[PDB]
């Protein structure tokens, strides 16, 4: 999770729908699993569901920066696609977990 790190309680509340449920970790479907705890009006329920779905979405516009490592890749006989590679945070956290399994812990030691 990336952003202002003072609202970590909201991500903690939205991060319990997969540890024993089918409405927060599986909130892409299951409208019964979405309405299983709301009990409020339909407008406030729809606004809360939209706000909960907008936690793994875009920031507002597709925007790069002048300090963001853009590149040209050449096509077979034609012009170009511009390529803006990003940093794989998830993959490198997976590989840091695998390297601490392989270098440290208790069994490898």
Partner RNA sequence: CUAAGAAAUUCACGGCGGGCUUGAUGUCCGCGUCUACCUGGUUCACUGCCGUGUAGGCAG
Chain contacts with RNA (rule: CB under 7 A):
66-74, 80, 85-88
What whole-number distance in Å separates Cα of residue 2 and Cα of residue 68?
Answer: 17
Q: CB of 61: closest distance to RNA in angstroms?
A: 18
In the complex with RNA, which residue's Cβ is closer, 61 or 107?
A: 61
What whole-number distance in Å separates Cα of residue 44 and Cα of residue 39?
Answer: 10
Q: Are 45 and 53 in contact (CB under 8 A)?
A: no
Q: CB of 38: closest distance to RNA in angstroms?
A: 41
In the complex with RNA, which residue's Cβ is closer, 44 or 64?
A: 64
């Amino acid at each position: 999770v990336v952003g202002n790190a003072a609202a970590l309680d909201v991500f903690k509340f939205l991060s319990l729908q997969y540890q024993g449920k089918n409405l927060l970790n599986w909130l892409t479907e299951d409208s019964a699993e979405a309405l299983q705890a709301l009990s409020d009006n339909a407008e406030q329920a729809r606004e809360w569901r939209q706000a909960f779905i907008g936690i793994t979405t875009v920031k507002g516009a597709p925007a790069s920066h002048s300090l963001a490592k853009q590149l040209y890749f050449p096509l077979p006989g034609s012009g170009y696609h511009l390529l803006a590679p990003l940093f794989p945070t998830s993959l490198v956290h997976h590989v840091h977990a695998l390297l601490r399994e392989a270098r440290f812990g208790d069994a490898a030691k």
